[PDB]
Structure 1
């Protein structure tokens, strides 16, 4: 999430995507959930493929994790945020603003790693 928020070319396309839905959120607020998919689905960037057929599994994952660890561990808003990206990818075919961002995210996923740098802190 905060990783993608630093890639300027992707940020330009996301400025269109955040705005076009009319949802009043900051980039920090959106990309917070992009961090959440990496932490819950470490295999998603390994597939390096961003299509709704792949993205549906991310929500299935949040649902499994939600039933196992409760709403205090996974928020119900994670599904709400997830739904926003779900419609964006499902209809990327008529949304070139996000389609370019889908391609850019795949490029960045393939260029990056599941883990890099001293992320020596998990839990709280």
Structure 2
């Protein structure tokens, strides 16, 4: 939704918080970096949050196909992204996306309809 503003910040921020690691931020970077994730939007196409598990999926999927092209350049800077993002989530001040993201884990017995044990139960 309107939260889209988050991306605008993430792009400028993440890139900034990156330069600190010794990285560079060029316009050509937005075209590729933006088009890269946008491809499969691994950041959760629903909430658009950060995901470590999914991140690996896109990482191996891109690295695998990219490798087939026997690339010599193989930019290592990508290593910094994983390291930064890895700890980036640790932040609790993450946009509300936290509540919409938590969707990752849900009570298997939230309702009676659930096959598992009902939400309400009694025991001696």
TM range (shorter): 0.3 to 0.5
Deviation string 1:41-61 (CA, Å, 9 cap, x unpaired) is 689636844221221111111
Instruction: Name structure 2 gaps, 5 residues minimum.
Output: none
Describe the shift of the 1:96–1:63 C-alpha distance in structure 2 as closer, same or farther (beyond 3 A): same
- 2:51 equivalent in structure 1: 51
Distance 1:116 1:93 in 2: 34
Describe the shift of the 1:37–1:12 C-alpha distance in structure 2 as closer, same or farther (beyond 3 A): closer
Aligned residues: 124
C-alpha displacement at 1:29, in angstroms? 1.9
What's the secondary structure of 1:47's corresponding residue? coil
The answer (yes or no) to whether the contact 1:52–1:86 under 8 Å persists in 2 is yes
Greater fraction of residues in helix: 1
Describe the shift of the 1:56–1:6 C-alpha distance in structure 2 as closer, same or farther (beyond 3 A): closer
Describe the shift of the 1:21–1:94 C-alpha distance in structure 2 as closer, same or farther (beyond 3 A): farther
Higher relative contact order (CA 8 A, sep 6+): 1
C-alpha displacement at 1:64, in angstroms? 2.1
The alignment's TM-score, normalised by the length of structure 2, stands at: 0.41
The CA RMSD measured in Å over matched residues stands at 14.6
Deviation string 1:77-123 (CA, Å, 9 cap, x unpaired) is 66676666556457889999999999999999999999999999999
Describe the shift of the 1:15–1:74 C-alpha distance in structure 2 as closer, same or farther (beyond 3 A): closer
Distance 2:48 2:30 in 1: 20
Distance 1:63 1:40 in 2: 14
